Amino acid sequence: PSDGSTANLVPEVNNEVMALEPVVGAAIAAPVAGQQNVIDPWIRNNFVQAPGGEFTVSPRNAPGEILWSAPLGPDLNPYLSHLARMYNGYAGGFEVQVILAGNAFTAGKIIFAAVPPNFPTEGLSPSQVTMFPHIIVDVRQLEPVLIPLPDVRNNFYHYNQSNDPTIKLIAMLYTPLRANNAGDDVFTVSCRVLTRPSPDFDFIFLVPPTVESRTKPFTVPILTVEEMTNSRFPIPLEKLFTGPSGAFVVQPQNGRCTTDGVLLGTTQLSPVNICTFRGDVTHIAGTHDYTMNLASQNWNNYDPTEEIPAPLGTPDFVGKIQGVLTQTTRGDGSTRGHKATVSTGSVHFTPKLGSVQFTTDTNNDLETGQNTKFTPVGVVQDGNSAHQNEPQQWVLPNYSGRTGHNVHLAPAVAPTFPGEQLLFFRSTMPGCSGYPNMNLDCLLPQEWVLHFYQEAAPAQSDVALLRFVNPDTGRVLFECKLHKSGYVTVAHTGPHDLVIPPNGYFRFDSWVNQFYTLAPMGN
Amino acid sequence: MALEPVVGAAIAAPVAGQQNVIDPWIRNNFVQAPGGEFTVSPRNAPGEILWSAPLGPDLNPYLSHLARMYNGYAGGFEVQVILAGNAFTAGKIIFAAVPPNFPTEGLSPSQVTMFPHIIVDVRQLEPVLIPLPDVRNNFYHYNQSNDPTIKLIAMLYTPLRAVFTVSCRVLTRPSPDFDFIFLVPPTVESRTKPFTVPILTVEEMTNSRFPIPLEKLFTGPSGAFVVQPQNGRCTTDGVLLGTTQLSPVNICTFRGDVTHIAGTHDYTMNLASQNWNNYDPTEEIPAPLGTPDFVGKIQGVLTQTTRGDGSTRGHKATVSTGSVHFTPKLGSVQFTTDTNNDLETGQNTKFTPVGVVQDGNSAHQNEPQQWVLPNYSGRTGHNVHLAPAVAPTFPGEQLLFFRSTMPGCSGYPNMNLDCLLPQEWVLHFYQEAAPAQSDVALLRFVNPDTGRVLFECKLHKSGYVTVAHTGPHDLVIPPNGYFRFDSWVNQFYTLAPMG
Amino acid sequence: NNEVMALEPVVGAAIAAPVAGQQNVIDPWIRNNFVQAPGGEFTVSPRNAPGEILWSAPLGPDLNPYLSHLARMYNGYAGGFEVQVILAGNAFTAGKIIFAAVPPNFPTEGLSPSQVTMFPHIIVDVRQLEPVLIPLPDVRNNFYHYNQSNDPTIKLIAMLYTPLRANNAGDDVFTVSCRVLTRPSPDFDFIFLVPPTVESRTKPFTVPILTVEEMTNSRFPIPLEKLFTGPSGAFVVQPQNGRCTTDGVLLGTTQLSPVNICTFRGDVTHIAGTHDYTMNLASQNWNNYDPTEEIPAPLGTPDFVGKIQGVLTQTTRGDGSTRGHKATVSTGSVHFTPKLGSVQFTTDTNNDLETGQNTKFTPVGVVQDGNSAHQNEPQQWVLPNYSGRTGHNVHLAPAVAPTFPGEQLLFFRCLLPQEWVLHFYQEAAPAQSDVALLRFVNPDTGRVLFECKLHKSGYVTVAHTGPHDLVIPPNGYFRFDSWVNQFYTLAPM
Amino acid sequence: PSDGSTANLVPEVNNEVMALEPVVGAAIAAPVAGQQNVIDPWIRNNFVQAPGGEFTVSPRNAPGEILWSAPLGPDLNPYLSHLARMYNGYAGGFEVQVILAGNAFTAGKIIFAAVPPNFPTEGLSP
Numbered sequence A: 001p002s003d004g005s006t007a008n009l010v011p012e013v014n015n016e017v018m019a020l021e022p023v024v025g026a027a028i029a030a031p032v033a034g035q036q037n038v039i040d041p042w043i044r045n046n047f048v049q050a051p052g053g054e055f056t057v058s059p060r061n062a063p064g065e066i067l068w069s070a071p072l073g074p075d076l077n078p079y080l081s082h083l084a085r086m087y088n089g090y091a092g093g094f095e096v097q098v099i100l101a102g103n104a105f106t107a108g109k110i111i112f113a114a115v116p117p118n119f120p121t122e123g124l125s126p127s128q129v130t131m132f133p134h135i136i137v138d139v140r141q142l143e144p145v146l147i148p149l150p151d152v153r154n155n156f157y158h159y160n161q162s163n164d165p166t167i168k169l170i171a172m173l174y175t176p177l178r179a180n181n182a183g184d185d186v187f188t189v190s191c192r193v194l195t196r197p198s199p200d201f202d203f204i205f206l207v208p209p210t211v212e213s214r215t216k217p218f219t220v221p222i223l224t225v226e227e228m229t230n231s232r233f234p235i236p237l238e239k240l241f242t243g244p245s246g247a248f249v250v251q252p253q254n255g256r257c258t259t260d261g262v263l264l265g266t267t268q269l270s271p272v273n274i275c276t277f278r279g280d281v282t283h284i285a286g287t288h289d290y291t292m293n294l295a296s297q298n299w300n301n302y303d304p305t306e307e308i309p310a311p312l313g314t315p316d317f318v319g320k321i322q323g324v325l326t327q328t329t330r331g332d333g334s335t336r337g338h339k340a341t342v343s344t345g346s347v348h349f350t351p352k353l354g355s356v357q358f359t360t361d362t363n364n365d366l367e368t369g370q371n372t373k374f375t376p377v378g379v380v381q382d383g384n385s386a387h388q389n390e391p392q393q394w395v396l397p398n399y400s401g402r403t404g405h406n407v408h409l410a411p412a413v414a415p416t417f418p419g420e421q422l423l424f425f426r427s428t429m430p431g432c433s434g435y436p437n438m439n440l441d442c443l444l445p446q447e448w449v450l451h452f453y454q455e456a457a458p459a460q461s462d463v464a465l466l467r468f469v470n471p472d473t474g475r476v477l478f479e480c481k482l483h484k485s486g487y488v489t490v491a492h493t494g495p496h497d498l499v500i501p502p503n504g505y506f507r508f509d510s511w512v513n514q515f516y517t518l519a520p521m522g523n
Numbered sequence B: 001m002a003l004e005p006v007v008g009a010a011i012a013a014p015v016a017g018q019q020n021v022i023d024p025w026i027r028n029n030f031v032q033a034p035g036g037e038f039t040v041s042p043r044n045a046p047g048e049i050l051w052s053a054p055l056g057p058d059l060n061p062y063l064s065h066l067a068r069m070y071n072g073y074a075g076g077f078e079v080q081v082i083l084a085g086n087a088f089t090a091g092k093i094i095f096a097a098v099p100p101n102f103p104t105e106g107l108s109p110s111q112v113t114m115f116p117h118i119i120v121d122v123r124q125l126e127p128v129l130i131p132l133p134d135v136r137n138n139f140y141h142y143n144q145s146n147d148p149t150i151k152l153i154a155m156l157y158t159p160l161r162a163v164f165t166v167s168c169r170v171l172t173r174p175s176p177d178f179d180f181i182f183l184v185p186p187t188v189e190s191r192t193k194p195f196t197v198p199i200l201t202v203e204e205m206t207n208s209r210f211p212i213p214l215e216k217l218f219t220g221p222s223g224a225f226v227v228q229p230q231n232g233r234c235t236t237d238g239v240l241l242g243t244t245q246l247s248p249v250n251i252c253t254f255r256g257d258v259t260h261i262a263g264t265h266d267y268t269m270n271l272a273s274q275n276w277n278n279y280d281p282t283e284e285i286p287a288p289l290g291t292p293d294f295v296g297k298i299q300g301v302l303t304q305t306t307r308g309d310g311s312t313r314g315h316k317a318t319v320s321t322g323s324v325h326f327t328p329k330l331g332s333v334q335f336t337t338d339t340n341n342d343l344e345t346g347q348n349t350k351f352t353p354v355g356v357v358q359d360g361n362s363a364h365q366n367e368p369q370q371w372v373l374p375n376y377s378g379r380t381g382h383n384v385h386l387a388p389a390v391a392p393t394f395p396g397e398q399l400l401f402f403r404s405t406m407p408g409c410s411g412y413p414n415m416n417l418d419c420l421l422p423q424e425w426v427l428h429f430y431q432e433a434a435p436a437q438s439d440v441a442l443l444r445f446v447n448p449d450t451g452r453v454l455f456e457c458k459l460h461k462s463g464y465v466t467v468a469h470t471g472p473h474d475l476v477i478p479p480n481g482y483f484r485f486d487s488w489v490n491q492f493y494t495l496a497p498m499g
Numbered sequence C: 001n002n003e004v005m006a007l008e009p010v011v012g013a014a015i016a017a018p019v020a021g022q023q024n025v026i027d028p029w030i031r032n033n034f035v036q037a038p039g040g041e042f043t044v045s046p047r048n049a050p051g052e053i054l055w056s057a058p059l060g061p062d063l064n065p066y067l068s069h070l071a072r073m074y075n076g077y078a079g080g081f082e083v084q085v086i087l088a089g090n091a092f093t094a095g096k097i098i099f100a101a102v103p104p105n106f107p108t109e110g111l112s113p114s115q116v117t118m119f120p121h122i123i124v125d126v127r128q129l130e131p132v133l134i135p136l137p138d139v140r141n142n143f144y145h146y147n148q149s150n151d152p153t154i155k156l157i158a159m160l161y162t163p164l165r166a167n168n169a170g171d172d173v174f175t176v177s178c179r180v181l182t183r184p185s186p187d188f189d190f191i192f193l194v195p196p197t198v199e200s201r202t203k204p205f206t207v208p209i210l211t212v213e214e215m216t217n218s219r220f221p222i223p224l225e226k227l228f229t230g231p232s233g234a235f236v237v238q239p240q241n242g243r244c245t246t247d248g249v250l251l252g253t254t255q256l257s258p259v260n261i262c263t264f265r266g267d268v269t270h271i272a273g274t275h276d277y278t279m280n281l282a283s284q285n286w287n288n289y290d291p292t293e294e295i296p297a298p299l300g301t302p303d304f305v306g307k308i309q310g311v312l313t314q315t316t317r318g319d320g321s322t323r324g325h326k327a328t329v330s331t332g333s334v335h336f337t338p339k340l341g342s343v344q345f346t347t348d349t350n351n352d353l354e355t356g357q358n359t360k361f362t363p364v365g366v367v368q369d370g371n372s373a374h375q376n377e378p379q380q381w382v383l384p385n386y387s388g389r390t391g392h393n394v395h396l397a398p399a400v401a402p403t404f405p406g407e408q409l410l411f412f413r414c415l416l417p418q419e420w421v422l423h424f425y426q427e428a429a430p431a432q433s434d435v436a437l438l439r440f441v442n443p444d445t446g447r448v449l450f451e452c453k454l455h456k457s458g459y460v461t462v463a464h465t466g467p468h469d470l471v472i473p474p475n476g477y478f479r480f481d482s483w484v485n486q487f488y489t490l491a492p493m
Numbered sequence D: 001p002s003d004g005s006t007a008n009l010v011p012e013v014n015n016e017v018m019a020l021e022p023v024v025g026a027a028i029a030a031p032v033a034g035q036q037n038v039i040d041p042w043i044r045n046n047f048v049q050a051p052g053g054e055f056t057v058s059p060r061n062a063p064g065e066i067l068w069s070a071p072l073g074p075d076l077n078p079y080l081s082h083l084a085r086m087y088n089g090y091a092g093g094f095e096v097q098v099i100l101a102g103n104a105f106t107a108g109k110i111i112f113a114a115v116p117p118n119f120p121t122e123g124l125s126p
């Protein structure tokens, strides 16, 4: 029966069964629900992969790590997820199916456990997880694991828009993954979670779709690298780059945005205003330098009291940016435009306090009362020092100059998982004079910032798994982890410029956590 | 009474592949259609089809969202019509069900009575109920196909007697025999995403004709000019037009190799594509994408980098559009710079635009003519593959422009720049590619503090907006106001006057 | 996931009986024996990643060569198939494949693995020994299908769900080879008997058995030499001769005669005192030339820039005068305007061409100017301006470039032999996908040397990088193997 | 039963069967043959390796290659091959046994097929 296929090398099914009583679904809610609704019976009879339906057991994982977790709710099932945007509430349980059919040369155990509502999941130890209803499964198990997930609760049903907690299903590495295949230890166990609603699950109140915040689904734009723009300087993107970041500190303040659309640092939505300055200008006697008193991005007054490190779009590196100051007189429409340069490392670069200093090519021809705009163009380098040393993209300017220290900064960013490096969207700045370091890396393209901002999709976990696909060949080039904090990571060691098909796009495949093990990509 | 019952998806069971069920509550509530907004005004006459819709899931917003999950459907609707008349408003409207392959073009009001129909007086208070059965000659309909279905038609049956515009609404709900057929994943390639307009504010968006932020909305008469820009041209279903491309930074840039012209401070640039790829002049495009679409002199900076040592140079530079040496379709443009010796030929060079200039000795505010297209192939031929020109079509209506003010670098220039669509709207339509269910998408501008509707405008499928006003006007807008897509309408829709 | 596909039963031709003309029978042996689809091959390799569609096919007679041959004598069909898929693995492997049924008119392109799970589906372990049986029902919204209408059908899709994890053995990488077999379900049947091989959409596609030597170039009236592959980044490959689509639509300036490829016919006029002559052109059938016709130029206009020397010939009506003169045409001269009707020749006599008499230019060779750069005069990939500076070149055949990584164009040294153009033109077989797989066979030994992709458009591509003259046996021929979905990755040289 | 040997690591037997009808042998020929002859019954009850009875599946082989082929006749059996040098004709069929007991770490499939007389074998695709 199983000769030449599985060969009795592998557990067939699990004895163990979770110690949960049966729990009623939406039937109790009928006298107090507005309506009695119906789900397409095919959805109830057929397992489909959950939005967060991928996880991995690899040798990089350590015992105690939660490899997969989810609270009970419509987001456990992609059909129910779209249906949920059309309903106000729900009640009832799920049947979850887990596939763990690892190669016969591997070893290890996973614990699945149901933790009840309002118990904190955060510090849980393997010992502690054993005290909930639980199942211990071998990483080699052949037949899918079936876990019923009842809607334990103390009310008639749940509202989509509230924060009342539900049961959480937890999968934790109970034993480290080991293997004895005698080759190279590539035998990572790729796992899939599929679900379907129990018969007692049901939606409750029909409401206008797409308007309830907590049901908007997450997506990632189909745009290509060439079609997007750098989020730290008004320039197009050119290539994808990964490299080690142990030496320096990656803490940009432009192109910083969370997956659910919260802007951070000095980040704003306009791709053109990313290194612009607007305000009134003042001559410095005897020199070609001017002092600019800052206006807001929309020509209103700037308030330093805002919980921001600087005005939105303030440059986030130390260097000399060359551009053009332009000015217009309201009465006659006279216009003047002169080459100008701002050094963000100068002690007179204090944009948090309201003033920035330019060095121009005139000591006249700039009025004191007219509005003036600095349009950035490129970066320059002092030719007498070491080549490629002046524009230090990972050095933050002192936004308050000599006074005080930088405040309310967006956090720094580093890989957290063994074997992983940041993935940078790299643009090449124009040089205007000298031998400058023209490399510019941002964490998120500006169009991704726009997309996350408008569609405020609740993050289902801390990491969105993306795969980069060549639409010509249908092939995946690499996979990467987009963290909710707004940065991307890949599995690679060393610097590398990526070889990308011109048509390549990012595709969102699954919600995962920080312990997901990425396929080795480079070379 | 004039139509028999018509079976829905039940007949399809032996060939369907699956048996599905729709939430029965969806058929217990009349709800306004994604279209479902039309207007009767005294400008309208009998014979104009004032409103029409085909049977399908797009008749009902609940079914419309569901349809993203199904491959097909079958069955009928019950539709409810509501007319906001008053006792001084005389006239009759006919609604009629016209069967799938009957031509509607040319119908008289008399002829419309020969279909299943209802004749309702414009001053009626109570809603009228129309049955819409899914008459067909196949087992069911596919969502991805445009096989025809019964059409509901609304026209004026007798002339209207009344500036009084009658607001009308169409609501629907599925018949009990309606059902979807094959459960399928909601993918992006399905083209089942419904059409929307970004939540972004005018203030926070960007002009599609020059790399500047937007500033205000402007309406004006356009009889003097020919409105035919080639940037910021995109269809609501995401088809780019003219020289329009997606990157908001490349909207007036040039990249290529540079050559000195002896004895002057002028240089010739041999152009490459935006991707630093070889340039092909055989493409069906008026010019390379991002080429300026107005006649004027644009001041910026030429930038150059030497492969090997990292040498970088930057010099004030100026492009004169419409000059005889402006031939970007042929592959070359001419700059006037502030140097005659310091630009190497082998190296790649980029023009970063900043602003426009005007010769101060000529008439003030005359140099940048935004509504005059340059000659993309210079003297050696005429412009080709153009995006069509744009003009108001409905009496009393003018174009609505998204206005930003260009930086001036010298002189007394016309710093006014109007685009038909914000660049972010081009981006949004491109990615979403929502199929247009009619020729006009009605937009309303909303104050989010109160929810109040400030004005309505027509976003035409061709990718341009019109509004009801006469004379020039800068719009007085709350800084946080946003555009909202409200309904599909047709060319006969009468906009509420604004101002 | 119980190994059963979540599809309802779907009736075949039984529903059609009240509306079909007649009742027919299929030989029961065809019904009882699984047969491999021509494109029914795919491979699971460790490079494969989740989401990659390894194989796809639409329901139809083209899956089964018996039904395909039978269909050429019937008017329609209805009903489904039983599919048998065989997986070549062992107990030391891990990984999952999903097979999914996608309903008619739904796009297969861009699906994520999560989304594919949302169809009726089956998840099969790479260790499965017994063949997997998938029923492919004829989901449709009509009573039955007509052969000539090419209705859309269900598609079977095979996608990698879990990567293959297995040791290798030495430097040989372990792969799981898969085969797709089919046979008609009991409810499948053909419908109306009709004269065989008449209905166009049932003709099978073929490729001439001719050898490279035995064929002829399509861009100049000269034989072929060898098969050449090379990178094409430096230049634009956009010929206008030898451009013909697989189902027999001619493109650009391509015509059928293998000798009229670079010829001119018309009446000739002297330019006083010079060695120049002006020819007002006709057609190749000796009719007036119409500039309104949506063609680049008269058919057979050369598709490169150069100076071609040949011989003009003229015959005077009435006396039998016979004149033949060495002559030269420059397609790069400013007076080459064939779209408007004129070309200029440079001869070695200034008084030997009468007025009003028919004159024909015969092509023999091209010429090189020894004072300019060597190997510079015959520019193969540069088109002339047929309009000759008036307006612009219009209605050109599209340019041609490989789009799949690792592939370069395969040239006949032209994109298609002239005999291939003739074959496609006559036997106008519909293409079942965008790519026809061709195999190159040595008839003596019977073994296959390489395979190439013949695109629906008139061009061929091969798997190799860098320029190369091919290692061709003298009697080798191309043999058509199958239509393949555009993701098919071919083995290198 | 197989604990310690083969160990369910390998397929045991094929349930597939060739779709051929039964065919009479030399019995039909008795009224027109010269004689009714006899073969030593041991030859009929015991498998012996054919003259061409070795073939290999190796990684150097490519799919589509015919690894083994033979037409029906006395040459399929070494005893019958010696006996056939004494007789003028023959009629009837054979039972052939193929041994494929490959190592458990290998993979791949072979097709066995019966092609009828007067069909060309030379160009056959899988």
Ligand SMILES: [Cl-]
Binding pocket: A208, A209, A210, B061
């Ligand atoms: Cl809605």
Ligand SMILES: [Cl-]
Binding pocket: A078, B185, B186, B187, C115
């Ligand atoms: Cl989805």
Ligand SMILES: [Cl-]
Binding pocket: B193
């Ligand atoms: Cl959406």
Ligand SMILES: [Cl-]
Binding pocket: B393, B394, B490, B491, B492
């Ligand atoms: Cl209109």
